[PDB]
Structure 1
Amino acid sequence: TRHSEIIKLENSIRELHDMFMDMAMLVESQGEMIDRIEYNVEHAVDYVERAVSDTKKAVKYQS
């Protein structure tokens, strides 16, 4: 009975390690993607803010 319990516990620990490995790699990829989107959205909002300001000043100068 010792062999059965010991091997079951070791298999469970191995499963813990494998699933946590996969989860950690996925979290790293998600963090990289989230950084990319942060920079993307910041630049996009800045560019649209510049474009709308340019349009406002242009229309005011014209009228």
Structure 2
Amino acid sequence: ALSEIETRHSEIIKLENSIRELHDMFMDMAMLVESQGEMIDRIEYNVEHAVDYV
């Protein structure tokens, strides 16, 4: 029955690794969206000055 608690342990660890991958997806999503928001800051500026520039 030590095999059983070994296999259970490797399922727990598979679950932790799967969660760490999910966590990295959430962190990467947040980083990307933040960078894109600096993009949109710029774009909105440019469009304010190209709409007042007509």
Q: TM-score range by the shorter chain?
A: 0.7 to 0.9
CA shift at 1:21, angstroms? 0.9
Task: Name the structure 1 match of 2:26.
Answer: 20
Query: 5+ unaligned residues in a row in structure 2: which ranges?
Result: 1-6
Cα root mean square deviation, aligned: 0.8
CA shift at 1:46, angstroms? 0.5
Query: 5+ unaligned residues in a row in structure 1: which ranges?
Result: 48-63
How many pairs are equivalent?
Answer: 47
TM-score (norm 1): 0.69
Structure 1 ranges of 4+ moved more than 3 A: none
TM-score (norm 2): 0.78
Percent identity over the alignment is 100
CA distance in 2, matches of 1:26, 1:7: 28
Task: Name the structure 2 match of 1:40.
Answer: 46
